[PDB]
A and B are shown apart, each in its own frame.
Chain A
Amino acid sequence: TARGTPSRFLASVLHNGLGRYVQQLQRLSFSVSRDGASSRGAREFVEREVIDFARRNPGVVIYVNSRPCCVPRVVAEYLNGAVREESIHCKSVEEISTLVQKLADQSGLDVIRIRKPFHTDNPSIQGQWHPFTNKPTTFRGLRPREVQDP
C-alpha cells in the first residue's frame, strides 16, 4: 500500500529531453548457461536478437557471460547509478526481447509511487494567489474603523 511503501515526485535525470535526449540505460550484463533448460530462451535471444539490439543502441555496452547457472539474469545499470536485476528464467525469446526493450526505455529512477502525474518548476506565470490578490486598496491604507489625523 501507499502508506506502507516510499514515494517520490515525478522527475527526470539531468533535465533529460530538454536540450537533448540521452538514453539512461548504460550497461546490460547477461548471464546465460551453455547447458540448462532454464536458459533455452536466453540462448536463442543471444543468437539472433542481441546482435540486432546492440546495433540500435550503440550507447549501451552489453556484456554476455556464458557460465553454469541455474537462473539466468540480466543486470541493467543506468547513468544515475541505479542497478536493476531481472531474472530471465524459463522466459521465451519474445518475452526476453520485451523485457530488454523496457529496460532500455526506463530512466532508472525507483519504480515507486509517484505523488503527482506531473512536475513543473514554474507553476505560475501571472503570480501565485495570496489573500490580497483580489482585495481592493483604500485611500491612505486605512484599516477598518481607524481614525485618521486624530
Chain B
Amino acid sequence: VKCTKARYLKKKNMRTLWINRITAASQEHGLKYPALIGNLVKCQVELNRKVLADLAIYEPKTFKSLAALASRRRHEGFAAALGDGKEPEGIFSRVVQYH
C-alpha cells in the first residue's frame, strides 16, 4: 500500500526539488523564483521546471541567458505599467499569434 501511494509523493517531491534548485539558480542572478517562471511564460517560453532545473546544473550559461531574458521582460512590464499607453509594446513583450 505504501509503494502504491508513494507514486503520488514521488511526483510531488520531484517538483518541490526542481523549484528549490531553480530558486537557487535564480538567486545567483538576483532574481526571485516567481519572477523567472512568470516572465518566461510571458515570452512564450514553455520550458518546464524539470528542464529548467537541469539547465541550471549542466547549462549554466544558457540559464543565465534565460534569467537575463526573464529580467528583461520583467523590466518591460514595469515600463508598460508606468506608461499611460503612449509607449509602444516592448520588443520582447510582443506575442506571436497562432490562428
Contact = CB atoms under 8 A, between A and B. Distances in A.
Contact of A128 (B2, B3, B57): B57
Contacts of B59: 124-126
B60 A134 contact: yes
A133 interface: yes
Contacts of A1: 2-3
Given A134-B28, A134-B29, A126 B61 contact: yes
Interface residues of A, number: 11
A1 B6 CA distance: 11
A123 B58 contact: yes
B58 A133 contact: no
Interface in A117-150: 123-129, 133-134
A127 B64 CA distance: 13
B62 interface: yes
A2 B6 CA distance: 11
B56 interface: yes
Contacts of B29: 134
Interface residues of B, number: 12
A125 B62 CA distance: 10
Contacts of B58: 123-126, 128-129
Contact of A126 (B2, B3, B28, B60): B60
Contact of B56 (A2, A123, A125, A129): A129
Given A1-B3, A127-B60, 13 more contacts: A1-B2, A124-B57, A124-B58, A124-B59, A125-B58, A125-B59, A126-B58, A126-B61, A126-B62, A128-B58, A129-B56, A134-B29, A134-B60
What 7 A-B pairs have minimum CB-CB distances, sorted nearest first? Answer: A124-B58, A1-B3, A134-B28, A126-B61, A123-B58, A129-B57, A133-B60
14 contacts: A2-B3, A123-B58, A125-B58, A125-B59, A126-B60, A126-B62, A127-B60, A127-B61, A128-B57, A128-B58, A129-B58, A129-B60, A134-B28, A134-B60
